[PDB]
Each structure stands twice: as structure tokens, then as C-alpha cells.
Design a protein around this ligand. Structure first.
Ligand code: PLT
Ligand code: TRP
Ligand code: TRP
Ligand code: NA
Ligand code: NA
Lengths: 385, 384
């Protein structure tokens, strides 16, 4: 339910029943061998797990500091880590007798992942997507359509992630007996932050085994970008009890933290309640939720997962921010230097990893979670550069 | 050099020296442990091999006949099988002491794969692309630019793939001292058809081990789309000596075989010499090569690799054609039924497998080479 004080289940009474049924189903199936057999089967043969752990030798030498390994979630079917959670929840939803999936999306990767999982399992998919994100992630909009999903543009508010989430939640309140709300990050009311983290923990379980094979030791640092926090939690979680391993989450610095146009909730937000959870949120002078910004639409959310709020409080993980321009430079850099076009979200992690490697010893090891590929971002990057 | 009567080195004298040097370097490195270790290392950690073999159960049960498996080359880094050949040749070029890679591209996927490989190994990359194709393929050209490759338009001839190869070959005559011409399919003068096939054969070696793991037996049929023929040779080659395994190559039928707007060289073309090889080409009465067409830009080539001409001749493989419309149907079908958006090229193979599966029994097995993903084709399918 809680991570320290953070998390919880602060929802209208209409959603208590559906959430409790989800809790019970998850508790029954999370360690069920047959459930995990089907999940592992799809992750392997359909999604293409395990993903490799790649040594960025050109990038490492160029920077001249620590070794930079990339965990290659960009290679997962769909082009991001989102699929790990999408298939897991869709399978659970099907076991619970649901015939419809709904989901918010910003980058469109979760929308696409959800549409793919829905296609695979013969479930109807409606995706809620901010009107601004419909325009700047158009590639993923047409993928969703071709996969047989309906894309619902959301015109209210900031026309982005938070607004998509409000609309999805309103849908779910009405449609829950046959609709599973397939939330795409470690956010929302319990049990979602736990479920999404658990389904993403495969990233870190693989990476741990892979870095032990490559280097015979655990990494000194793990760097991951933080929108809602799922790819970060996925790669972090298996290392949390390893005392050697520093954990760094990288939030969207936007136009700068003083610009009022960023998504760094942990760095510059206040504790508060929204979307069923106590966590960090960007707030205005009256204490209301204020709109966020990032060039990477997957990071463009005023909130953050409560497990990260907890990791920040106990100082198990450090949270930093990287600006739009810094992220753009890393996007170009990785493409030219390693021949990998990353997602703009992932480019934030690369950007900070390049800063951090520079300051570190050649003996030391950084693992960056390369959460996605950048095909979706080509229009954005074309306009910006 | 030859596959039956097909193949050869039909080039000017200026290219004979470079090809002998390429052949010598390849014979040296092909079976060498160090070359193969480094190649396998990149294929594993950078490209993400092995790719899975996926049982398309929903598609299978919908059609109601044979089991349809998909060899998932769509999951290779870059989104297509081309990467396998790009890494192999780029690495070969690098050990040969070359500092520059050139390549043709039409669809843009090989250009992107060549650009990626050059970025990986720290070599300059110029991609030759016919002017009509530069215009047709905005985003692939942009991908190449982002990877640090220069894209050179070719306004010679019909301003397309055949002309890019000619312009690429013209470049290589002058620059072979420091440049490797990284050819994108099983075409061109020897040793290119053999080299590209060898670097793609991993697809088939994986598929064979994976189908034995999944089903305890070899497939009844393997279906692959054929542009120049590299993904098909890659999956076919390790099965060629398993005589029970039926091999079907699917060419672009376009607007129809009788419309004269297709790229089915094996089906409707005639024997010819072009681009350094003797093989099948769509051509006019003077032996001049005819324009080709396909909705799938990777199949839009008037020729085909000589090893396919050979397999057709000795009847080891059957070659069929699927139309633009049929390929579009399969594209939508696979997306909606399995949640995999295939490349339009690969959709030709899926389309034929769907027809073939209906006439076969459930205890029989079809492997389709899903040569790529459809992210590159979204505008084409939206505009169709
Ligand atoms: C490639 C890639 N990397 C990183 C992220 C950051 O998300 P996380 O921190 O969870 O790893 C995203 C988010 N993509 C989502 C954005 C999103 C969906 N649901 C959310 C809830 C809260 C915050 C963000 C999102 C998408 O719509 O595709 C992504 O697509
Ligand atoms: N503070 C909640 C209030 C709310 C309205 N409708 C909801 C539905 C589900 C959960 C919370 C709500 C929010 O994020 O808007
Ligand atoms: N035209 C496709 C495939 C291709 C590359 N080189 C070829 C040579 C012959 C036939 C097809 C090809 C591309 O550029 O990606
Ligand atoms: Na945030
Ligand atoms: Na052809």
C-alpha cells in the first residue's frame, strides 16, 4: 500500500471495489507459476527478452571516464520498456475476465504497447492521449490505429499526460466491470505502483546477471530517466539491497527549473495528493497541480511514482534533472557515436550519464537504462534541430 | 563465383582488382575465430541476436490450417535483417583497413543499417540513393543524417535503386583504396552474393535450432519475401540440404503480373546481365533493364540475386508473387491479430503464408521470415 508515507489509495468510493479485486487478483497471480509461464513465454518469443547489455566503447573512450553500459530496452517489441508492463497487466486483465483495456499515453509507447498486448489477447483497446501528444508523437498514433486501437484525443487542460490520466480515470469509474485500466507507469492508487514495478523488475534482473557476466562485478552507478518512474524502478529494484550500487534517477529539466516549464517533481515539487497517490507533484501558489513540460513527451507529467519519493526520502537513490537542450545533444551524440537513435526520454539518462562518467574513474562502471528507441521523436528532433 | 550458370563478375577492368582484394580478405576472415568472435559480439550485444521464433497462434487458428511461425527479424536493432549484413561487411572493411563505407539504398533501410554500422565502428558513411527515392523516403534519409551519414542523390538514369548502384559502383572504382562498397542484398559481382548470404545465414541457423526446440522437427515450408533476396537466402541457406523442407520466395506482384507494374524478376523477368551479375531481370528487347514497382519499397528492384536464379532453376525453391493489395491486407491482419506491425516487404511473405496455410494441415509447420517492422511504412499504408 505504502512506501514510507507515500503511495496509498486515495480514490472515490466507486473505485475501491475494482482496486480491491485487482489487489486480490494480483496477490493470487504474481507468484503463480502458470501465470508467469505465460508471461515469460510472451516476453521471450513475442517481446524478444532478454534484451542485451551493450558496452558503449566509442562513447566511453570519447568521454574518457567510467565504462558506460546501455541496457537495451530500445530493442523490446514496440520500441520501449513499456511492453514488459503492458503484457503483464493485459494477461492479468484477461484472467480477471476483462474484455477491454484503457490506458493513458504521452510518448505513445505505452499506448502502442497496450494496443499490441490488446491485439495479441483479443481485447478491445481505447487509448486516452493529450491533443499536444497526438501531434508531436504522430508515428505512435498511427501504430495504435493500425493495431486496431481507438485513440481518444484529450483537449482539456494542458492537452498532455495528466489530462489523459484524468479522462482515463473518468472512463474507468464508469466501465470497470469489463474494462481494465492499464496504467503505464509506477503511479496511481495501490496496487499500480507495485504491479508496474514488479513487471518492470525483469530489466534489472537481466542487467544484474549481464553485468556480472561482462565485468565480474556490480555497477558503481545505475542511471535511468524518470517520468512516472517505471523504467527506473524496473532497473533499480533488484539492486536496492546491494550497498555498492548508487541509483540515479534523471527527471525532465525542461526549459530550466526556474522557467516554470519542467517535470522535475522530486527535485522542485511538493508532497501532495493526486491521481490516487501521495507523492511529489509540481504545484502552483494556491497548492493546486500545475502543468509540466518536457521535450520528451514520456517525461511530461507533474507527478512521480511514490516509490521514488520514498527512495529520495531514505536517500537510497539520488534524483537529478537534465534540460531539453542537454537531452537533444545526447540524442544526437548517441546516434552518431554508437549508431543507436534513443528515445528523447532515454536521452535524458544518457545526458546525465555522460556528465557523471566524465567525473569518474576508468575502472568504474555505469549502467544506463536505454528505455526506448527514437523513431517516434524524429519530427520533434527535425523541428528542434 | 557461380551458382549454376548465374552470378559471375560482369564489371569493367577497373573493378577486377578491388574484387580480388575483397575476395582474398573474405577467404582469410570468414572462418577466422577472432573475426567471428567480434562479429558475434556485435550481433549479440548491439544488434540483439538471437531474435525469437514466434508462434502466431491467433493468426494460425483464424486461418485454420498449418501452424504459422514468425522468425522475428523485425526485432533486430534498426528494425530489419539488413543489420546482420551491415555489421559483417563494415567489420570486414575495418579489418581490411578501409576508413569509409558507401552503400546503395532505395527503401532507405540498408542506408540506415549501413549508417548505424559505420557509426558503431567509427567510419565515414556516404549513402547513394536515387533522386526519386530520396523524395519518397524522407524519414529514412533523416535517420541516416542523424547517424552521421551523408546522403547523395543520384540523378543518372531513372533516378532510383538501379542508378544508385551504378553511382555507388562509379564511386568505388575511384575510392576502393580507402572505401568499402557495402552492398545491401545478395546481388552484384562476386563475392557479394556469397558474402551477404553468409552474413544473413545466421537467421536460418537460429530458426532451425528454434523450430527444433519448439516443435521437435524441421518446418514443412519456409516463406520469405524476395527483393534482391538476402533475407530469403539467410533463412533458406541452412535448410537447402534438408530436402523435405519446402522453400518459397515471394516477389512483389505489384499491381498484378499482367499490369507490367511489379518486381517479380524470377516469375516474369528474363535472364540478363546487370550490376555485375548474371541473373533474372525485368528487361526490354535490347537487354536494357525495365522499371520495376512495388508498394513495398524494399522489393522495388527489377533484378534478383543469382543464388535464387539457381535455386529456381534446379527447382530447390518455388517462387511466387503477391500483389500490393494482398500485402496491404496481410499488413493490417498481422497488426490486428498478433500485435506485430510488419514491414510491407515482410507482409508479402505473410500474405502468401496465409494462402498456403489454409491448404495445409494443422500438424504442418510454416516459418515466415518476418524480415522487418512496419514503422518505416506508416505513411505509405496511411496514404493507401
Ligand atoms: C521510451 C520511454 N522512456 C521513458 C519513459 C518514462 O516513463 P517511466 O518513467 O514510467 O519509465 C517513457 C514513458 N512513456 C509513457 C508516458 C507515460 C504513460 N503513463 C504515464 C504515467 C505517468 C507518467 C508518464 C506516463 C508513454 O505514454 O508512452 C518512454 O516511452
Ligand atoms: N485529486 C484527484 C481527484 C479525482 C477526481 N476523479 C478521480 C478519479 C480517480 C482518482 C482520483 C480522482 C485527481 O487527481 O484528480
Ligand atoms: N531497396 C532496399 C533493399 C535493397 C538494398 N540494396 C538492394 C539491392 C538489390 C535489391 C534490393 C536492395 C533498401 O535500400 O533498403
Ligand atoms: Na514528473
Ligand atoms: Na526483383
Amino acid at each position: 500500500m505504502w512506501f514510507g508515507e507515500f503511495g496509498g489509495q486515495y480514490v472515490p468510493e466507486t473505485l475501491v471495489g475494482p482496486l480491491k479485486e485487482l489487489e486480490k487478483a494480483y496477490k493470487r497471480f504474481k507468484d503463480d507459476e502458470e501465470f508467469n509461464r505465460q508471461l515469460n513465454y510472451y516476453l521471450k518469443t513475442w517481446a524478444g527478452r532478454p534484451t542485451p547489455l551493450y558496452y558503449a566503447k566509442r562513447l566511453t573512450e570519447k568521454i574518457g571516464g567510467a565504462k558506460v553500459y546501455l541496457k537495451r530496452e530500445d530493442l523490446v517489441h514496440g520500441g520501449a520498456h513499456k511492453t514488459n508492463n503492458a503484457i503483464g497487466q493485459a494477461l492479468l486483465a484477461k484472467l480477471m475476465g476483462k474484455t477491454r483495456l484503457i490506458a493513458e499515453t504521452g510518448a505513445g509507447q505505452h499506448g502502442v504497447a497496450t494496443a499490441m498486448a490488446g491485439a495479441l489477447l483479443g481485447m478491445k483497446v481505447d487509448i486516452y492521449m493529450g491533443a499536444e501528444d497526438v501531434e508531436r508523437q504522430k508515428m505512435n498514433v498511427f501504430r495504435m490505429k493500425l493495431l486496431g486501437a481507438n485513440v481518444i484525443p484529450v483537449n482539456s487542460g494542458s492537452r498532455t499526460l495528466k489530462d489523459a490520466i484524468n479522462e482515463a480515470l473518468r472512463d474507468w469509474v464508469a466501465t470497470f466491470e469489463y474494462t481494465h485500466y492499464l496504467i503505464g507507469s509506477v503511479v496511481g492508487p495501490h496496487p499500480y505502483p507495485t504491479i508496474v514495478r514488479d513487471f518492470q523488475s525483469v530489466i534489472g534482473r537481466e542487467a544484474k546477471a549481464q553485468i556480472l557476466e561482462a565485468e565480474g562485478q556490480l555497477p558503481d552507478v545505475i542511471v535511468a530517466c524518470v517520468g512516472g518512474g517505471s523504467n527506473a524502478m524496473g532497473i533499480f529494484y533488484p539492486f536496492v539491497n546491494d550497498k555498492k550500487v548508487k541509483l540515479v534517477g534523471v527527471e525532465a529539466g525542461g526549459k530550466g527549473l526556474e522557467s516554470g516549464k519542467h517535470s522535475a517533481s522530486l527535485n522542485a515539487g511538493q508532497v501532495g495528493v493526486s491521481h490516487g497517490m501521495l507523492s511529489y507533484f509540481l504545484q502552483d501558489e494556491e497548492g493546486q497541480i500545475k502543468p509540466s513540460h518536457s521535450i520528451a513527451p514520456g517525461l511530461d507529467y507533474p507527478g512521480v511514482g511514490p516509490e521514488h519519493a520514498y527512495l529520495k526520502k531514505i536517500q537510497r537513490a539520488e534524483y537529478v534533472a537534465v534540460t531539453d537542450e542537454e537531452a537533444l545533444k545526447a540524442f544526437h551524440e548517441l546516434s552518431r557515436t554508437e549508431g543507436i537513435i534513443p528515445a528523447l526520454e532515454s536521452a535524458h539518462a544518457v545526458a546525465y550519464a555522460m556528465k557523471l562518467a566524465k567525473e569518474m574513474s576508468r575502472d568504474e562502471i555505469i549502467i544506463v537504462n536505454l528505455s526506448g528507441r527514437g523513431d517516434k521523436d524524429l519530427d520533434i528532433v527535425l523541428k528542434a534541430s
